[PDB]
Structure formats: C-alpha cells, structure tokens
Amino acid sequence: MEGEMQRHIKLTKAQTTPVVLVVGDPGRVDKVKVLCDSYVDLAYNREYKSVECTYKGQKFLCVSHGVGSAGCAICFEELMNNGAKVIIRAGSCGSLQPTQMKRGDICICNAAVREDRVSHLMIYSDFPAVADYEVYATLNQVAEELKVPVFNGISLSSDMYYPHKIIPTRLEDYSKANVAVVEMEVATLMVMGTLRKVKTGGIFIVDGCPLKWDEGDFDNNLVPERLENMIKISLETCARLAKKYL
Amino acid sequence: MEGEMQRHIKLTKAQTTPVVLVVGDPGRVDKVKVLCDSYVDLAYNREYKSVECTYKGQKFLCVSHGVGSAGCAICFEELMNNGAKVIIRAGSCGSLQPTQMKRGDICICNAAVREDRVSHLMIYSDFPAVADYEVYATLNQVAEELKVPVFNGISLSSDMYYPHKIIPTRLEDYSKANVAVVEMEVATLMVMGTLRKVKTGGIFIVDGCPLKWDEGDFDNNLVPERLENMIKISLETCARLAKKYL
Amino acid sequence: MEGEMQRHIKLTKAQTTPVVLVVGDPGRVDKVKVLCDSYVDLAYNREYKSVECTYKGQKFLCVSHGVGSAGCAICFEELMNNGAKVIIRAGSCGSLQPTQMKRGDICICNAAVREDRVSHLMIYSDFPAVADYEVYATLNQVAEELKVPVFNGISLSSDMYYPHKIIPTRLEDYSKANVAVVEMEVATLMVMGTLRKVKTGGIFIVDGCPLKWDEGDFDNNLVPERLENMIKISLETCARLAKKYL
Amino acid sequence: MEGEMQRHIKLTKAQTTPVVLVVGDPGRVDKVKVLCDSYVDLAYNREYKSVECTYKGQKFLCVSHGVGSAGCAICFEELMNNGAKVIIRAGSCGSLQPTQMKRGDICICNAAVREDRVSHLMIYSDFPAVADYEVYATLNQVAEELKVPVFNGISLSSDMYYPHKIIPTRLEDYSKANVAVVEMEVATLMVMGTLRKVKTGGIFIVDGCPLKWDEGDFDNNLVPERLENMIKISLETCARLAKKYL
Amino acid sequence: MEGEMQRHIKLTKAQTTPVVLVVGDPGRVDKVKVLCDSYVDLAYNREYKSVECTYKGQKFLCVSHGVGSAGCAICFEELMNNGAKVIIRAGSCGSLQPTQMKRGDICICNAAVREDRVSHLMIYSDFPAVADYEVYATLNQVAEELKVPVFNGISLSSDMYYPHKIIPTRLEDYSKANVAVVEMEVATLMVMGTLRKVKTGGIFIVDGCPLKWDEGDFDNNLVPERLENMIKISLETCARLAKKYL
Amino acid sequence: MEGEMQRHIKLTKAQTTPVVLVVGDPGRVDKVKVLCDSYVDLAYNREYKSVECTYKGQKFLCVSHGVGSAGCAICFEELMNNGAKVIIRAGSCGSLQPTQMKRGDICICNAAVREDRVSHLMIYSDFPAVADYEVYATLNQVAEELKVPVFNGISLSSDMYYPHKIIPTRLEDYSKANVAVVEMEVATLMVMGTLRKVKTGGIFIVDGCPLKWDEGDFDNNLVPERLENMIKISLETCARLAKKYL
C-alpha cells in the first residue's frame, strides 16, 4: 500500500484540505507557518513546499507554486486533482498606479489580464480571468475587521518579467486601462478555477514599482509588517472559508 | 441656449442620474416605468428610449440600448459621457446549463466572455470583462431579501445570434467551460465600465434554450412574473445604489 | 392559424418582398415612406420598423435595423429567412477622404472593411466583404440618370464609434489605404449576402467628418435635399430591381 | 544614358502601357501574342516575360508573373511603379463548385479570399480583396458580345497548392461559403491595386477540380478553344480599356 | 560593500561562469554535483539552486530554473545579465515518437516549438526557436565519443502539462509534424539566447509517454544509469565548451 | 508508356537525384551548370528550369524555383514527391547587419523567420523553421576547406519585397533580434523539409542592403567572384552529400 501522490507536489487526497493558501516562494511557506497556531510539514519537492496550517481552529494547506504561470499551473491542477475547493494566491506585486498604490499597500484582486499561455491552452482568449466573488468578498471583510486599509482592482498577470528591446510591454497600456497591479500567476489560477469549479482569489502586497518612481529596499524583504498584515488577512480568510467547508 | 445633448440618446448631463438601468428593448422601458413610483419620459431617438424612474424614493434612468454590442456601446459611452457612475444591464438570456438553469430562472452575472469586436477595439483580448463587485453584491443581496432564487455565473456575450454553416459557434465549448448564460451586450458594458471607472453589472432572465432541450412559448412575452421579480430586483438595486450616490 | 413571424422584425414570408431597402434609424423609415407612391405600415418591434413601399409601380420593403453590426445582423438574417433576394443599405457615413468627399456628398459602395465580429463568426477574416456587382451597377446607373454626382469606394465598417485612450483606431490607416467612407453595418450585410446568396449593396450620404476638418450642423438633420437625392436613388434602384424579381 | 528599368521585370516607364494583361506562365505570353494583330518582344528576366501586344488597334503589354503571390507581387508592384493604370490577371483555376462549374468553364472574378501573406503585409486582414468594378463590368460585356458563356464569382487565392497532413485546407469551407474558383494570385493583385489606385480584375478558365469529381487530361494543355475564348475576351477587354487610357 | 546579486538566482557576475548547465529540479543540482570533480554551493533562493561544478579541469555552474517557461525565463535572463555565454538545458521529456524513442532514450535538440508566452513577448511568432549549432554539435560529438546512442530532433516546449476538456492539445499534431519530444522550457531559452547573443542547447532523457503506450515506473526516479549517461554527456560538453571560454 | 512527371517542374522520379541544389533565377541554372564537370539539361517549364549536374564525380540536380514562397513551395513539394532527400537553397539576400555583413559577404543559414503564408498552411506558427544540422555543418566545413570566409545566422524569409505606406515592415525589428540576412524562400523550404523528412539548408550572397547604407551596382550581376565562391561551396557541398546518398 502506497500513499498515492500527485506527481509534482507529492501530496495525497487525504492530506489535501478543502482550502489551500498558495504562495510563490517556498521560503514564504516557512514564514506563513510560524504565524499559525500549529503546523504539520507535508512535502517538499521541486519548488512545491507543502504544510498543513492550523489557524483559529481551522486546518488548511499552505503550498508554494514557484515563479510563473506554467509552473504554478502544475501546482494548481494537482491541488484541484486532490479535491481543493478554495485556492487563494497570496503574494507580491508591482504597482501599475504608482501615484495611488505604493510599496507596502495591499491589493485584493477580483480579476486579471491573461498575459500567459497556459490559460489560452485551456480556453479561448475571450474568456474572463475572474476571482470567485465569495472569496474576494471574504478577503475584503477580514481586512475591514482587522482595520487594514486595502485597494481593490484587476491584476496584470504577465509571463514577462525582464523586457526585451524589440517590442513594447503592455505595462503602461494596462495602467491606462485602470489595471491596479502586476504579477505572474493569478490569471492562470482564476481561469483554471472557473473551468474546474474551484473557488479562487488573490491578495497581494506592493513590493515593486515597475513603471517608475520610487523606492528603496530593493527587496525581497518585501516590507515587514505590512507584509504581516497581508499574511494575517490571508490566514484569517482561509480559516473563515475552511469553516464553510467541513 | 440649448440643452446640450449626447448625439444618439439625446440626453443632457443634467438629465442623467448617477445610476442608470439599461434594457435592450425600447418596449421594456415602458414596462419598467409602470412598476416605479413615478416617471418622467425624457427622449426617444433611434432605439434609445429614456425615462427617469422614481422608485423607493430614489431617482435613476431607465434607457434602452437596442440589440447588439456596437449599438449598445454607443448608448453606454454617451451615458458615461453624461456622468453615469453605475450602469446595470437588465435583460433576457439563453441558458448554457440547461439541466440546471431553465426558462424563468434568473442569473446575476459577475463576468462575461468577450465575443464582440468593440471591446477589442478598446483593449487587448487578454483583459477581463468583469462586473463591479459592489454592483454584483447588491443585486444578490436584494434578490435574497426579496426571497427570489437566483443563479450566479459568467455570461457569454456573442455578436452572433443566427449560426452559419461553415464554422461552429462556441456555445457548447463555453457550456463545458461552466459559462452560465448567453446574451449579446454585457461584456461590452463591463469592459467599457472598467476602462472609464463606471461601475457595472448584469441581471438576466432565461427566456431561451439555444443548446437544446425545451420549451414553449416561443417568446418574447418572456415569462410573466418571474420577469416581474427580475425587474423588481433591478429597480430595488438601482434605488439602493442611487442612495450611495447623492 | 397564426401569421408565422421572424422573432425580431415580426414579419412573415408573405409580407416580405424580394427587394428590401434597409436603414439604421426607425425614424428614417417614416421619412422614406413619405417619398413613395403609397405604403403599408407592417410591424414595429424593438428597433425594427417595417413598411411596404410602393414606388414607381413596384413593391419593396423599407426596414430599420438599428445601430451596429450585431443588431443589424439579426434584421438581415431574418429578412433572408423570409426570402429577401436583394437588400440595399441606405445610410449616413463619415468621410475618410475629407479633401475629396464632403458633407452632403453621396458614396456608392462596392466593398467594405470588416471591422466587426459577427462576419468573423460566419467566415474567416480572409474572406472579402463585397457588394453584388449588379446592385452596385444599378445604383450608379440610377444616380447618373438622375444627374446626381456620386463617389464610388470602399467603406470601413467599424463597431467602434467612440475611441478609447489606449489603442489607436484604424481610421487614418484605412484613409491611407484609399477607403472612402466609414459607417457601422455594410460589411456585415455584404458577407451574409454572399454566404446566403442574397444580393446586397450600399449607398451613403456624408454627414460626418471623423478625421478632422469641417463643419456645421452637428447633425442628424444630415443634410436636407442631398439627403432627398440619396433616398430617391435608393428608391428608384429598389424599384428597378423589384421589376427583375416578380 | 541608360533605359532605367524595374529590377525584376526589366521594363522602363516608356515601355509600359496604361493597360497590362498578366499571365502566370511565361509560355502563355507566346501563346497570347500569336492571337494579337502584332507584337514587340520586350524583356525576359527570371519568370517575367514581357511583350507589347497590338490588338484591335490598341497597344497594351502582356507580362508573365510566375506562380504564387510573393513572386507575382514583385511583377505587379514594378508594373505599377512604371505607370500601369489597369492590370487584368488572365489564368487557370480550380472549380470550387464542381456540380456547376466544370473544366473549360470561364469565371470572371469580382473579389477574392486573401489566403496569402503579402497582402497582409500591406494592410490588415479586415480589408477586402476586390476587383475594380469597371474592369469586371468590361470583361462581362465583352464575353456577352462574343457569346461566350461565363460564370461570375469570388476566387480563393491560396498560397498552398499541395496539402499537408496535419491541418486541413479551407477549400471545402470556402466552397460552402459560395466561393466559385481557386487560384494563387488574384487577391494579391486586387489589394495592391486598391492601395495604389490601379484598376484590376481577373478572368480564369477551369482546368482543375481540386475537390473531387472529374476529369481527364491531366493538364496543362488546359483546354484548347475554351482557352482561346478566355484569351480573346481578355485581349478584347484590354483593347477596350486601353482606348479609355490614351 | 555588497556582492551585487541578480534578484532571483542571487548570484553575482563574479560567481557566474561563461558556461552554465541548467536543470529544472533543484534536487537535480545535488545529483549533478556529486558526479563532478569538486563543487562550491553558491546560492539557493526560491526554486533557483546554484553550484559551481569543476569537471575535467573546468569550472561551470549548475543552476536550477524550476518548472515552466515564465519561471525559467527569470533564471535565464539573470544568468545572461551576469555574463553567461553558453547555457545548456539538461532535462526530462516525453516521447512524441513512441515507436522510435522510448523511456531511457536520450534526445539532443536543435530547435523547438514555441508553445509559451514569454518568447512571444520578446519577439513575433514567426521567429525560430533554435539551438546554437556549435552547442548542438558538441553534445552530439561527446555522446558519440562516450558511445551513448542519442536521437536528434525538435522539442515541443508547451506551457500546458495537464490537458483540459474543451480544446485539444497539439501533442498529436506535432508528432505528425515529426517533433521528437515534449518538455516545457527549451524554446524560451533558445529564443532568449538568439536575442541576447548567448549560445544555447538542450539534451533530454525520455521519462514520459504522454501519447500513449507504455510504461512503468511512474517516475521521477526517471531512469537510473541512462540518466547518468545524459548527465555525463552534459558535464563533458560543458567542460569542452568552458575550455573555449577562458 | 509515358515518363510520369511532376505537374510543374516536369521531372520524373528517375530523373531526380537524392541531392538537389535550388536557385531562384532560371538564368542561375545555366551559370551553375558551366562550373560543373558535365551536365544534362532536363526540363524547362514555367520558372522551373532543371539540369543534372556532375561535379567532383557526383550527380545532383540544379533546379530553379522562381521568386517567392508560394511559387518555390510548388518546386520543393514536387522534388520531395520525386524522392529528393537533401535540398539546398543557394541564393542572394539583403544584409540585416549592415555594419558587419556587406555586399559580397556569404551567409550560411541554420534557421529562418517564417514571414510567409504557405508554411502556416502546413503547420502552426509556433513551429521552428530550421535547417538540417548536417547540411548546415557540411556547407561550413566546405567553406572552411576552400578558405572562403562565411557568416552564420538566421534568415528573415519575407513575402514582401516592396513596402507599402500604412504598416511598417519588420526588417528593423528583426535586425534588432540579431537576424543576419533577408530573402524570400528559405523558411518555406525548411519547414516543408522537417515535415517531409527531407534535409535542407541555405547559403546566400549579400547583394542587397535594404536597411540603408551602401552601394553600387544596383545588381543582379550580384557580385562576380564572391558569387563564384558561394556557388563552388554549394556545388562541393552537394557532391559531398550525394556521396552519402548512393
């Protein structure tokens, strides 16, 4: 008898909770778990590190997915294979509204620009990348109760981090179209969610200013403390939803 | 001195309320207005019929936009030109989930498939067609308070009503992708909304079964009564939002 | 026993003549009909107003189709469903050759740029939007006999009326490509025509200068008189063709 | 002092008539010229063979362009560079309506499907490939006077002659869309014509049945005699138009 | 004074050798390094694990890049930022020629299908994904000297691992087009290489049969021994090239 | 009994050697053949002129294909139909690296940009246009032995020779992407090769400076002597490969 695991994340159905918090950095999993009530280390294969969190009485996984849409898609498909019903991406982003949203600001995302490939391999470009509206609402509610100021908006999910010389990026064009922030994974998660009837959402902390003006600190110590707040919102939200899902 | 009107809808800024309810049929405007507390007929040009509704103490317009994305886009741009802050499309749709959603069922829509052209003339296909999440939430809340059962889902907004022989439609493909309903305008409204910082949403009554099995009654007497309920939700929602917008 | 009607235009086969004149504005139907020998009001549903014209001994319909490709496509499919053999669009346009074609000038169109969606839902982009060459020839002949000066050229049929900020329109690019005028429907009509073996064409009066320089009068009183001439050419052409079609 | 020639066809402005008949096969130039009143051999470089025809009192060139859109485009650009005002393609095609149009039948073409690349390098796919309507009308008129039965229709201009195994051709799809015939050059000519204000058209003899059923004779002796008729129509048309162009 | 590192891989220019071997699995770095003469652990951040290999007298890095095109692109851009002149991807693949290439077989790749997004964000789809031909030649030469049988061919680089229900994958289509193997990263590497004047190539071991028939062993213990051979070829090749690059 | 020929090139299987040298200009065939040991004129139909070369003891064809991708594709498909195993394109090109590669310089090409249509009619754009690496290697080896300096690089294969006014060419963009040279046929050959398991490659002499600066001599006397060298490399390479293929 074997524990029958998913190929890449190496988790079984039985280890997989209804609710899963996903992060990009495997190093983020260890930081998240220290803020929980208790945890159980599960698996660490490739970039896919898995813990069971207990937080505010509730069990849910935290799982790292790596950088970028194709790599994270493998994580997300395998979690959904294992029965996940709710997946929330918690991460860093760049601000596309640099006068309004600065380093440290937190953005809760209802939808995303699909500048990947894998979503297009699932379904036609016309199809919207959209959060589940209960998951989005819950993140907002929790942030309000914790008195943590948040922005809401669309994310640009772009497979390109480093620009080349020949053709422009769409960072400015999407800023003009009122897209809030930019990162690399949430469109892929949202589309796959809708397609597989798994509820998804996204919360992000601004740690990058890819347009222009401002700041610092270089990174990824992100920012402290504003970072803690975003993680707490994430954990509180995951707990509230795992209650729905017993 | 002239009252300075928008070219097609023939309304002035001063006549345009923060909240506007949009319908496809100019004949629907007259049906909506009879369910209000009071109304003022405004203008009727081309397919664009305009009334000011008073309902539950609040003023907001009801405006017809005609069939199809390019024609309704003219309506919507001109309303936004005049200062509309909230536009809600209330209409008929076909069911893409015919085992689950039948004639008479009401669907409140958070997002849409962009099978138009004009949204693509505004912004790249990758960009999501998405409702404002406050508008979506308010429609749901009102429906719950009125004890009217509702579905939630994505709409396919397709410029094609009558299929041709050569290439398939994507009606089945989008059904498989868990798209709830199909109509012809809401993607165009949602994208333009996001682009112009105008809050939008969509509520629809199933009056068509474009896949296959079922029913009737032919149309558009729609259905009575279930129709009344959808209109009431619309009107109640518009009132609740116009309160926010004094 | 019912008179079995098309869903949107509400006309029966028996009411539908071989030749149909289509206009955008339902208000235009009433203006056209006053210039005929006699008429019979048929139906008025949504933006679709229908009259039978008698002009110079011949019977043919005048039918309004509303603004924009998806809405007019419903009109045109339903007319073709009812046996129409010839459909001519008579309308307003903008000049893309503003030094050459001014307000009041009339353009008879042999082909169009397909900047819609619905034609692309019928057939691949490579396929030409083209008038029937008998219909085009007849409009020219009638104009010559009536000593009304006309231009000939390609129309840009664009689903976008109001530009957005992010991506350019192709109005200038198509001007450089020697496209004469711009409107919103005739490409859709032409493609559907070819596909369904229905003869089509387009005549337009310049009432807009969307590039730049010039003029006036704002609109849509169009222009008088030059407007009358375009309508007369339309009516004379429809009569000449209905003779072919007894 | 040099006679300043175009790079590929090696003709000067002074040698280039307002009207030019173009054929694919350089061997066709020699066959055409024997049916004229008199000729002057001009140049033969690469696949580009050039003669001045005199026919029915009028001078015009016959020029070979080779097989396929990119090669013929070089011919056509260089002729237009030299002042050609009218270019007519006279050639062979396959029947896409094999019940209606058989080997030997002649088709006069008003428009074409753009299944090339070079037209797309000139202008967006939405733009129609269309004959000048005077050139099309003249071919028809001449055929009628010569009592030669002709078909009229759209041509599929396809860069692919030999199909591969992986993706289908659009031969059947375009047959279903009522495209008459298939060849390899006329879309490219038509678009370039419109773009450069040069009047174009196409007449073709069915020598191929690429769908299926029928026939023979293998080719390219084409067919005799029906072939002569198509060439005569071509020559007569070229003469009639060169008269317009003194 | 800081050692100035690349953001994600956390390596400095001074730590970065002209030649770099890239692998997907950070666990593969530890397996590679045990087969070298000596090593120096450098950095481990996110999925990016870095060692300096010494093998056969020569120094070159081995660096993990994670699963999938967008994540690995960050690795590759940062290595090129640091002066890498040669990057070779050594990994696992699936066989697209399952009668010819089986589990354990090794394929040296000269080119790839670009089924990513990020390469398309760099340059137009028309642009070829191609290995440097010296790097490809060297891998072949080394394999021949080591008497290790190898296949040569094109790789399909696909961002999709798990298929969805709505639209087909192109795995079969590309098999029919004589594509050898399928993996997820090498197209992205090849294009970026050409664009930045960095020499690239790919060697892969078949550990997957995504079409159909065959086998086993499940994975990723890959296969032993055939795996060792592929790694040895990789290491020998890297050494031979680092000699060129002192 | 007939010698059963391919439709356009008019060659039989028995006349077709394993190795074929292809040139654009039928006039080039006569120039090539004079540099061989002996030849046999085979066929001359349309732009397709065919000779059997004997050079350095070996037999292989030289065949002209005309200008441009669709016309040459017919040549290449028919040669492959007849059993050709190796086809090498030898021709002229323009320099896209005008500081580095000048008139007279010779470029041996491993890959190409697919700016045709016919390759896209065979297979999806993502698929690479790539030379066989043995053919590429052999051209290089022969050039080295003959002490003829050569460049190596990617070719832009573009169906457009004469630019139009509306949309830019990609000549500069591809120069920035490190594409070496530009011509009109080799991408089409490479893709078809891979698809049909026929080994291909390309060698070119710079006779054009389509960017800008420089030179002369106008053309196509190309250049002497540097031209002879490129032809000799071609012939030597063809001989070396025909030896492999007895």
Author numbering:
A (entry chain A), B (entry chain A), C (entry chain A), D (entry chain A), E (entry chain A), F (entry chain A): 1 to 246
Give the article text.
Purine nucleoside phosphorylase (PNP) is central to purine salvage mechanisms in Plasmodium parasites, the causative agents of malaria. Purine nucleoside phosphorylase (PNP) in Plasmodium forms a key enzyme in the recycling of predominantly host-derived purines, catalysing the phosphorolysis of inosine to produce the major purine precursor for the salvage pathway, hypoxanthine, and ribose-1-phosphate. Crystal structures and sequence homology studies have distinguished two broad families of PNP enzymes: those that form trimers (such as the mammalian PNPs, Type 2) and those that are hexameric (such as E.coli PNP (EcPNP), Type 1). Crystallographic studies of PfPNP have shown it forms a hexameric assembly suggesting its closer alignment with the Type 1 PNP group, although functionally it has been noted that, unlike other hexameric PNPs, adenosine is not a substrate for PfPNP.
